[PDB]
Assembly symmetry: C6
Homo-oligomer: 204 residues x 6
C-alpha cells in the first residue's frame, strides 16, 4: 500500500483476508472487510488479495470477467496514444494496467503518487467491488420472500434473518407481512411509522 511511501502488503493482512474468505465465503460482510483491508492498496496489492484465495474459483472467474468488462469500458472512454512514449515520462494507463496485469509496481506507484494522481488503486478497487457485489448477490441462499417468522421463532431472530438476507440480495411493510400471526397482530396495532426499535420492543 501507499501510506507518501510504498509499503509491502503485510502477511497479517493477507492471512486475515484469506481466512475471511475461507470462513465466511461470500456473506455480505466480506465486501466491507475487503475494502477495509485494502486501504491505499496498489493494483499489485489487490491482485495479491484476490490471487491467494484457493477456493471459490467459479466466483474468482466471474470476478475476472467483470474486471475485463470494466477494463474494456475504460479503454473505450480513455484511449491511450499508441507509439514510443516520451523518454523518461509517465505513460497513460490502459485498463489492463489499472488491473495490474500489464503494469509494474513501479509504474503503479508513479501513477498513484503523481501530481495530480492517476488513482489506479482506487479505480481498480471499484471494479473489484462491483464484481464482488454480483457474487454476493448470486451466493445469497434465500429469497427475501421466503424469510418468514416461524410459529415459535422470537421476533429478534426473525428480524436478524430478514435483514441479513436483504443485505445480501442487496421493507418494514414486508417485514410485518412475513411476521407470524401473533406478532403481526401486535405490529399492525402499532400504526404507521413505527421504528424498528418500537416493533422489536412490542414483540419482545
Amino acid at each position: 500500500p501507499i501510506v507518501m511511501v510504498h509499503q509491502a502488503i503485510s502477511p497479517r493482512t493477507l492471512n486475515a483476508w484469506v481466512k475471511v474468505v475461507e470462513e465466511k465465503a461470500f456473506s455480505p460482510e466480506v465486501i466491507p472487510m475487503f475494502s477495509c483491508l485494502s486501504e491505499g492498496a496498489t493494483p499489485q496489492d489487490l491482485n495479491c488479495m484476490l490471487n491467494t484465495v484457493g477456493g471459490h474459483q467459479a466466483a474468482m472467474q466471474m470476478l475476472k470477467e467483470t474486471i475485463n468488462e470494466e477494463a474494456a469500458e475504460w479503454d473505450r472512454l480513455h484511449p491511450v496514444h499508441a507509439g514510443p512514449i516520451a523518454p523518461g515520462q509517465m505513460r497513460e494507463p490502459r485498463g489492463s494496467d489499472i488491473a495490474g496485469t500489464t503494469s509494474t509496481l513501479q509504474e503503479q506507484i508513479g501513477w498513484m503518487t503523481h501530481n495530480p494522481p492517476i488513482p489506479v488503486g482506487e479505480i481498480y478497487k471499484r471494479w473489484i467491488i462491483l464484481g464482488l457485489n454480483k457474487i454476493v448477490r448470486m451466493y445469497s441462499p434465500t429469497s427475501i420472500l421466503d424469510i418468514r417468522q416461524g410459529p415459535k421463532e422470537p421476533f429478534r431472530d426473525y428480524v436478524d434473518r430478514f435483514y441479513k438476507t436483504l443485505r445480501a440480495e442487496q421493507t418494514e411493510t414486508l417485514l410485518v407481512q412475513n411476521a407470524n400471526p401473533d406478532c403481526k397482530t401486535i405490529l399492525k396495532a402499532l400504526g404507521p411509522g413505527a421504528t424498528l426499535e418500537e416493533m422489536m420492543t412490542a414483540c419482545q
Copy 2:
C-alpha cells in the same frame, strides 16, 4: 485513525472488534470496547467497524436508524449553504458527511485536522454510542426486578448478577430487598450507609 497523520485501521483492531461482537453479542462491556478500539477514528474507520459485523443485522439496522435520526437533527441545527463551493476550500459537513456516507476519507481528514477542527469522527462516534446504548438496553435479558438471590446462592454471585443487570438496563436498597432471608437479616442489621464492601464481608 488520526494519530498529526492518518493511518489505516489495523487488521488486529478490526479482528478484535468483530470477535468481541461475535462472542459477547451486546453485553454492556461491548460499548467501552468499541470506544477504546476507535480512538481518533475517522467516519470511514467507524464504518469499517460496524460494517464488518456479519450477524446481528436487526441491531445493525436499528443502529442505522438512530444514526439517521441524529444526522437529520444535525442538518436542522447546522444547514449547509447550497451551491458550488469556493474553489479549493473546505466545505461544510452535513449529517451524511459526518456519518461518512457522502464524504471521502480525504475530506474527513481535512475536517478532522483543520484549525480549528471540525471533529467529524468524534461527532459520529457519539451518534453510534447513542445507538449502541439503545441496543444494549434492548438485548438485556432480565429485569433488575427479577434478579433475586437464590436460597443457596453465595452473596457475591448474586451481587455480580445484580450489577451486571443494572449495567445493561443502564440500588443498595433494592439490593437488600432482593437478597435471600438469611443475608437480608444480616444486611438490615448493618444499619444505614453500609458500603458494598461491608455488605459483602457481612454475608460472606
Copy 3:
C-alpha cells in the same frame, strides 16, 4: 499512554488485561499485571482497562466506591476555584477529572505533559490499586490459619499454598507451626534463623 507524545492503548494490551481478569479473577498477581500493562496511562486509558471487564461487576462496583472515596478526599485537600477559567489556560483538576469522568483526553494529556506535570494518570492509578487491593483481600478463599500441611503433602507444595495465601490476605513461625509432624520435627531441630531455602532442603 504517554510515551513525549500520546499513543492510543493497544488492542493487544486491552485483550491481555481482559483475559487475565477472565482467567485469574482476582488472584494477587493480577495487581502487578494491571500496573505493568498501564505504564504512563492516562485516566481515559485506565478507564478502558476497567470498563472492558464484563464479569465481576460486584468487584467493579466496589472499585468505583473506593475511587469515589479517594476523589472526595482529593477535593477536600485540593479545592478548585469556582468560576470561569482564564481564557486559554490549564484548569485545576478535581477528583472526577483525575478519575477521568469529567475530563477530556486533551485535558489529561495537558496536565500530564505540563511543566511541572500534574500527574493525573499516576494519581488515579494509585486510587485504583488501593481499590484492587481491597478486592484481592476480599476474594482470598482461605485464612492463612487454615493453610496446614497435609500428612502426605510435600513440603514444597505446602509452602506454595502458604505464601500464595499470605500474598492475597496481604511468618516462618506460623509456617513451622502449620507444618505436619514429620517436617515440624525436622524444622524445630534446625534452630532459629533458618532461611526458607534451608527449611525446604531439610524437608525435601
Copy 4:
C-alpha cells in the same frame, strides 16, 4: 528485503510461508502467496523461504534443477570477465550469484541498490516462479478432461472444481460439454456468448 535500506526477513513471514506449504502443498494459490510474501526480497531472503521447507524434497530438488538451468542460460547470455576485479568496485553477477549461492548479502544489497540497479532479487524470483509453475502442474491430481458434473452435483460446485483444475494445469465450451444432462440442456439453450454469471444463474 530491501524496503532504501535492508531489513531481515521477519519470522512471521517465514512462518507464514512454511505453514502454507505444509497445509496447501502445491495447490496453485501457493505461487501468488510466494510472490506476495517476498516483495523486494534479496536472493538470501528467497533461499530462506525455500530452504526452511522441510517436506516435499522431490519438488525442492526439481526446483533446484530449474534454477540451475536458468543460471546456466544467464551465464550464456551474460559472461563475466575472469580475473581480479577492480579494487573497491562492484563485480558482475553470474548465475550462481543471482541464485545467492556464491554471493554475499552485502553484494546482493549492492547490486539491488545500485544506480542503475542489477535487480538480482527480481531475476532470481522469476527463475523460482518458473520452477514452481512446473511443480504446480505436476502435482495437479486430475485432468481437466476428467472434471465432469455429477448427476446431483450443484452447478456451482462443478464450476469450482473445473476452474480450480484449470488453474493448476495452467473453456466455456468444455465447461458446457462436461456439465450433466439437465444443465447442459439449459446451457445450450442460452445460445453463444453467455457469461459465466449467466450460466451459473441459469443452472441454479
Copy 5:
C-alpha cells in the same frame, strides 16, 4: 527497558515469561529465557517479570530472601550519605533502590542513562539470577548419581537425561560408568579422550 530512551515492557514479553514459568516451572532453560527477555531492563521492569508470576510462591519467597541478602551486602560495601540530598542532583542508590522497591522509574532511568552510568538494572539482574540458580538447583528432581542408562534405553536418550540433570544440578567418566553393560563395553574399548560425538556414534 532502555533501548537511549525508555520503553515500557511489552505485553508480549510479559506474557511470554509468565507462560514459560507456567509450562517449564524451574527447568534450567528458564534462566536463559529470563536473561534474554530482560535485556536493558530497569528494576521496575524486572519486578514486573517476577511479580506477575502467580504460582510457585515458595520459590518467589526464596528469591526475595536472596535479593535481600545481596541488597544488605550492597549496603555494606556502598553506604549512602544520610541527609538531604543536593537540590536537583542524582542521589546514591542503596540496595532497596537497586531492587526497585524504594526507587522510582524516573530515578532508575536517571541512574542507568547517566555518565558514567550506575547500572542498577544490570546489578539487580545479577542478584535475581543468583537467586534463580539456587531455585533451579533445588527443584532438580534427581541426582546425577541416579541417572543410569536403562537395559533397553537408546544411548542418545540416556545422554539427554544425563546432561539435562547436570545442567540443573549445575563427567564423561561418570557418563561411561552409568551406561548399561553393552554400551559400557563399547565405550571402554574406545580408549581415553573420546568426544561425545564419538561415544554416541559408537553406541548408536
Copy 6:
C-alpha cells in the same frame, strides 16, 4: 541483532526457534531456520537461541564441544597480546570472546560495528552451523542405502523420502537402482540424462 544500531532479540524470534527445535528436533531444515532467524546476531543473541532450548542436551553438549574446538583453532591462528590493553581502545577477541562467554555485549557491538569490523557474530555463527551440521547427520534415522521404493509406493513419495534422507546425511543413479521393478523398467528405458521432472512424469 545489529540492524547501524543494536536491537534486543525479539520474543517472537526466540519463541519461533525454541518451537522449531521442539517440533522438528534436528531435521535438516532446522539449520536454515537457525540461519534465517539470526541475521546480524551478536554472540550474546546466538547464545540466547542455543541456551533457551530445554531438551536435546546431548546434542547441545556436542555443540559446545565443536564450538570449543573452533575456538581453540581461532586462538592458534590469532593469538592475543597478553597484558593491560591500551586505555580506551578496542581489544583483540579470543575464541571465548567470539563465542560470547568472556565478552560483554558492549564489546561485541564494538567489534561488529567497528571500521573495519571484526565480525564476531558471523564468525561464531559459522562455528555453530558446523556443529549443527554434525548433529543433523548424527540424528538422521536411516541410511540412503535403505531408502527403497515400496511395491505400492507412489514414485513421488519415494523420491520425497530419498531426497529428505540425502539432505540429512548431507544420486539419480542410486535413485533408479532403489526404485521398484515397475518404475525401474520405465526409468531405465528413459535413457541417460533424464531430469528429475522427466522421471517423475514417467512414473506418475
